[PDB]
Amino acid sequence: PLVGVKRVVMSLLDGRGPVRFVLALITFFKFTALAPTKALLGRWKAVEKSVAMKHLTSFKRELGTLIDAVNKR
Amino acid sequence: PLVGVKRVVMSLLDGRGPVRFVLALITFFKFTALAPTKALLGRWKAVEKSVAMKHLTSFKRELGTLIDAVNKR
């Protein structure tokens, strides 16, 4: 059976795991235009607006950092 | 056997698929602080700097729009 991150990601696609990880995997689907699973969308809709804002704005700062690192390769 | 997005994501964790999708899933690992697979890191190291800059800056604009939609719930 699956172990490590592959197990973690499979579980997220079945609706299980931390709220921050749900929100992150939703951003992946937004960037790719792929179809999220029903269980993941279920988790996403139930997240409190204030909780969603906090994690997503933190993702944007981290994406900025990543872009700076790439620019300096 | 796996079908739909689960098959797409499994293949990406084995290093297979479009460069935009590799870059997207790398951002998922950055946001979560989870460990990427060796096969995924291999694809990421091989991406041309200009190609990486283009997709990652487009992700940042899409994340902004997503934050806007959450603010307006």
Author numbering:
A (entry chain A), B (entry chain B): 26 to 98
Quote the authors verbatim.
The Japanese encephalitis virus is a flavivirus transmitted by Culex mosquitoes and is closely related to other serious emerging viruses, including the dengue virus (DENV), the West Nile virus (WNV), and the Zika virus (ZIKV). The nucleocapsid is composed of multiple copies of the capsid protein, enclosing the single-stranded RNA genome. C proteins have roles, including, but not limited to, nucleocapsid dissociation and assembly. The JEV capsid protein has a helix-rich structure and forms a stable homodimer similar to other flaviviruses.
Here, we present the JEV capsid protein structure at 1.98 Å resolution. Similarly, electron density for the first 25 residues from the JEV C protein N-terminus is not visible in our crystal structure due to cleavage during protein purification. The purified JEV capsid protein, whose size was reduced to less than 15 kDa, was crystallized, and the solved structure has a visible electron density for residues 26–98. Each monomer of the JEV capsid protein is composed of four helices: α1 (amino acid 29–38), α2 (44–57), α3 (63–70), and the longest α4 (74–96), connected by short loops. As is the case for the DENV, WNV, and ZIKV capsid proteins, the JEV capsid protein is a dimer, created by anti-parallel pairing of the α1-α1’, α2-α2’, and α4-α4’ helices, connected by extensive hydrophobic interactions, hydrogen bonds, and salt bridges. The JEV capsid dimer is connected by 13 hydrogen bonds, similar to the ZIKV capsid, with an average distance of 3.06 Å and 2.87 Å, respectively. Almost half of the amino acids of the JEV capsid, of which 41 are residues from the first subunit and 43 are residues from the second subunit, are involved in creating the hydrophobic dimer interface. The large hydrophobic patch on the monomer surface that mediates dimerization is concealed after protein dimerization and the rest of the surface is hydrophilic. The α1-α1’ helices of the JEV, WNV, and ZIKV are found on top of the α2-α2’ helices and protect the hydrophobic surface of α2-α2’, thereby forming a closed conformation. In this study, we crystallized the JEV capsid at pH 4.6, 5.6, and 6.2, each in similar crystal form with identical protein conformation.
